[PDB]
Every structure is written in structure tokens, then in C-alpha cells.
Amino acid sequence: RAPDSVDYRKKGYVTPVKNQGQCGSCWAFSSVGALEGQLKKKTGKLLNLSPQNLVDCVSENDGCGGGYMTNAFQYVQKNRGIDSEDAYPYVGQEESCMYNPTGKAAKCRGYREIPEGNEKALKRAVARVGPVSVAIDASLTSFQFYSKGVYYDESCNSDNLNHAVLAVGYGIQKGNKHWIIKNSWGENWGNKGYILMARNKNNACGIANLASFPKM
């Protein structure tokens, strides 16, 4: 049995909240977040990796038109590296691939998927591994206006995954189980860029339907 609560922000595994701007690059922020957690876990260094590297270079993804985190991990594995943010700065528009091996800050040895719909497996993976990339339905205005508490909306559609975020922990707020979710909509959004999402409420918003983490 894993701990009852985990918060990777307390352990220094999570970088500041980013703003994707007018680009469908959520998948690239999700992906770098999970790679950043494994880098801190294995090396002791917390550094910003390059979402822009993924947007421009993951040819199996659609740049600002969307993508999957598994494709991004497979690219970093095949490419033998991903740049730091400092070597490959975020623009928020899709450009030609300008990967530079000199600015390489992490590698990837592949990835694992959480069994679809399994919040028990997702909990165990967050505890054992660290921050996990997840996909959700973030389409509801209830989600967009989030301020506090543990987000739950029965209209959330688990078969309508449209947003990629990062599970950096889980807990219980006054008896309500939750996932601690880092968003990429800037510090201004939600609770300083974070949302607590309902946990063990029948896979609310499809939180455990498309979860993955990189090997390092």
C-alpha cells in the first residue's frame, strides 16, 4: 500500500507552472513535466526541459495541433536526448526542428502506460515513480473557472480526452480524495496553475484513461 498522500512539489520534483499560450502544446508540457520529475529523481537536479523541442521535432505529433505524450517519450528515446528550456526556448508557435545535442539535458529509455481506467494503478505509479503524464476532458466551463476545492462535474466526459496535464501527487482534502494536477495555462489559472481533481469517483474526467511515464 502506497502512502495516503504524495506531493512531489514538497520534494522539489516539479518546476514552476508554464503558459502554453495559443498553441495546442499541452502534450509537450505534460511530457516535459514527467521527464523533469524523473531527471530530479535520478540526478538531484531540477531544471526546465524544452516543450518547444517536442512541438517542433516530434514528427508523429501535430505540433500546435495536438499530440500524445507516448509519442514524445518515444521521440526523446529515438533522438538520444531532449534539450533544456535554456538551450531551446518556448515560442508557442510551431517552427522547424532545431534540436541541438549541445543543450541535451535528459534522456529517455522508453515509457510505460497505466492500465486504462485504473485509478489504483495510477496512484501506485505516482507514489513509486513520481509525476505521471495524464489526459483529461478539460472542455467544461466548470474546469476553466476552477478556483478551489476538489473538482468534480458529472458532465465531464471520460471518452472525450482533449487536454494533457501532470499528476504531481494525490491526497484527501477534508475527506474528499483528489489528484494534484499541474496545468500549463499559467500561474494565473485555477489555484496558482494547479487543480485538485476528484479521485476514486469512477475515473472522473478520464484521469486514468491515458496515463504514462517515461523510463530514464
From Swiss-Prot:
Entry annotated with the keyword Disulfide bond? yes
**A Gene Ontology MF term for this entry?**
cysteine-type peptidase activity
Q: What is its EC number?
A: 3.4.22.38
Bridged cysteine pairs (disulfide): 23-64, 57-97, 156-205
Question: Where is it mainly found?
Answer: other
Name its GO BP terms in alphabetical order: bone resorption; collagen catabolic process; extracellular matrix disassembly; mitophagy; negative regulation of cartilage development; proteolysis; proteolysis involved in protein catabolic process; thyroid hormone generation
Write down the chemical reaction(s) this protein catalyses: Broad proteolytic activity. With small-molecule substrates and inhibitors, the major determinant of specificity is P2, which is preferably Leu, Met > Phe, and not Arg
Q: What class of enzyme is it?
A: hydrolase
Active-site residues?
Answer: 26, 163, 183
Keyword Transit peptide in the entry? The reply is no
- Tell me the superkingdom of the source: Eukaryota
Localization per Swiss-Prot or TrEMBL: Lysosome; Secreted; Apical cell membrane
Q: Which GO terms describe its cellular component?
A: apical plasma membrane; endolysosome lumen; external side of plasma membrane; extracellular region; extracellular space; intracellular membrane-bounded organelle; lysosomal lumen; lysosome
Q: Could you tell me in which tissues this protein is expressed?
A: Predominantly expressed in osteoclasts (bones). Expressed in thyroid epithelial cells.
Topology versus the membrane, per the UniProt entry? Peripheral membrane protein
Entry keywords, A to Z: Cell membrane, Disease variant, Disulfide bond, Glycoprotein, Hydrolase, Lysosome, Membrane, Protease, Secreted, Signal, Thiol protease, Zymogen
What is the documented function of this protein? Thiol protease involved in osteoclastic bone resorption and may participate partially in the disorder of bone remodeling. Displays potent endoprotease activity against fibrinogen at acid pH. May play an important role in extracellular matrix degradation. Involved in the release of thyroid hormone thyroxine (T4) by limited proteolysis of TG/thyroglobulin in the thyroid follicle lumen.
Q: Which family does it belong to?
A: Belongs to the peptidase C1 family.
Entry's disease: Pycnodysostosis: A rare autosomal recessive bone disorder characterized by deformity of the skull, maxilla and phalanges, osteosclerosis, and fragility of bone.
Name it.
Cathepsin K
**Which organism was this protein described from?**
Homo sapiens (Human)
Species classification = Eukaryota, Metazoa, Chordata, Craniata, Vertebrata
| Range within the parent protein | 114 to 329 of 329
